[PDB]
């Protein structure tokens, strides 16, 4: 029910599996040989994604899952200008 989005630095980001399948790429990486990990939580190595930006990716997962089909007005995702470019390439690669 939880996946372990390990970044390039080494920071494991144990986020819920339902949160992780927000991104199509993580869903693909958890399908096939990626789901064969028997040790409960699946580890998804991200040697190209640094930890400081994968943390924002996981925050976006927990943000979009909680704010999906919301009846009230929705706030924009707080994204820092100094991380915006790195999180843009992280959003393309993850297709989220």
């Amino acid at each position: 029910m939880y996946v372990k989005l390990i970044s390039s630095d080494g920071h494991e980001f144990i986020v819920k599996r339902e949160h992780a399948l927000t991104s199509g790429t993580i869903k693909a990486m958890l399908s096939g040989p990626g789901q064969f990990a028997e040790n409960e939580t699946n580890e998804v190595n991200f040697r190209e994604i640094p930890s400081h930006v994968l943390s924002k990716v996981c925050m976006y997962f927990t943000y979009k899952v909680r704010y999906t089909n919301s009846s009230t007005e929705i706030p924009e995702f707080p994204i820092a200008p100094e991380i915006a470019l790195e999180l843009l390439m992280a959003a393309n690669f993850l297709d989220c």
């Binding site: 630095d9 080494g10 920071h11 494991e12 980001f13 144990i14 986020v15 819920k16 949160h19 943390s55 996981c58 925050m59 997962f61 927990t62 909680r66």
Partner: peptide, 16 residues
């Protein structure tokens, strides 16, 4: 509802 990042050394539990 409250949202937390339970961090110990490098793990970061994105739980609610």
């Amino acid at each position: 509802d409250v949202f937390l990042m339970i961090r110990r050394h490098k793990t970061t539990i994105f739980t609610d």
